[PDB]
Design a binder for this molecule. Structure first.
Ligand SMILES: [Ca+2]
Length: 306
């Protein structure tokens, strides 16, 4: 019986920007995909992948579940996604380049967590600028869903119950980009907030985890902030994972599965790995009693769970 799985999770394909979703007895891990053959020696990202597990050590590869070619209005940049389930359907939020436009958020819909996903037909969020990447979605206890996104500015909308529209009266809301919320740092706002927001609630505390840029630093680390409310005010928490052992990017995804807590992240540790050929990894961790989280070291692998 296999009882351990050594990182990186998947070894025959380069993956990044992990977004776990637990539904019932199964954890589904959605990722971006760094092509084996790079175009112009640079990031080459066309489709999204899904890998599932029932036990954290045996993984099933579902291949491409959605792609830029499935989105009629988008031409480039299959960037960090997140999926969510609601009312018997699965929604995949994907940041992409809108042809002849800026960065927009697509929503794909499927009756299955492993697709194939069908694009809505037009963008869900489309402000005309280049900020709105790396969406994260969470459905709160009161039934209100939120969609956060952005680099270098964190923004959100209130998603409606159908998950394919948002409240246009509230519109797109900007988060104040303060040191109080996101620490001092080297990103465009002068705070450490970078990209890859990951929004959720656990035991009456809300969390915003993100890729971050420290003062005087070039590479991303992972950090987090907290709030008593889903829309703030956000207060800086601390470092969740340092840059050590990583590549220029890191990107967080957190899930509880069968009573255990996991941080998914990425590195360039696969054979032939690099900043453009990444690999998703996972570390188990535990929360402090007061809801804070100590820094998580990079991890050799995880144990089977039941
Ligand atoms: Ca993400």
């Amino acid at each position: 019986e296999k009882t351990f799985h050594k990182n990186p999770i998947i070894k025959d394909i380069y993956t990044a920007d992990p977004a776990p979703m637990v539904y019932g007895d199964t954890l589904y891990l959605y990722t971006t995909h760094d092509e084996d053959e790079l175009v112009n020696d640079f990031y080459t990202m066309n489709d999204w992948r899904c890998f599932s597990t029932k036990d954290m050590v045996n993984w099933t590869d579902h291949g491409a579940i959605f792609s830029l070619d499935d989105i009629g209005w988008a031409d480039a940049r299959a960037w960090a996604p997140q999926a969510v389930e609601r009312n018997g359907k699965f929604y995949l939020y994907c940041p992409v380049h809108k042809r002849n436009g800026g960065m927009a958020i697509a929503v794909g819909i499927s009756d299955s967590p492993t697709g194939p996903f069908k694009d809505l037909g037009y963008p869900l969020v489309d402000e005309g600028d280049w900020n709105d990447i790396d969406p994260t979605v969470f459905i709160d206890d009161d039934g209100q869903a939120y969609l956060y996104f952005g680099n270098p500015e964190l923004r959100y909308v209130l998603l409606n119950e159908n998950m394919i529209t948002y409240d246009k009266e509230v519109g797109i809301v900007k988060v104040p980009m303060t040191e109080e919320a996101f620490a001092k740092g080297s990103h465009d706002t002068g705070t450490s907030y970078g990209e890859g927001p990951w929004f959720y609630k656990r035991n009456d505390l809300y969390y915003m985890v993100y890729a971050a840029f420290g003062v005087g630093k070039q590479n991303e680390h992972l950090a987090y902030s907290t709030s008593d409310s889903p829309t703030g005010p956000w207060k800086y928490g601390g470092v969740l994972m340092t840059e050590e052992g990583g590549v220029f990017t890191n990107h967080p995804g957190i899930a509880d599965f069968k009573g255990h807590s996991y941080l998914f992240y990425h590195t360039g540790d696969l054979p032939g790995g690099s900043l453009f050929h990444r690999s998703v990894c996972v570390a188990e961790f535990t929360y402090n009693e007061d809801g804070t989280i100590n820094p998580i070291p990079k991890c050799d692998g995880v144990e089977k769970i039941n």
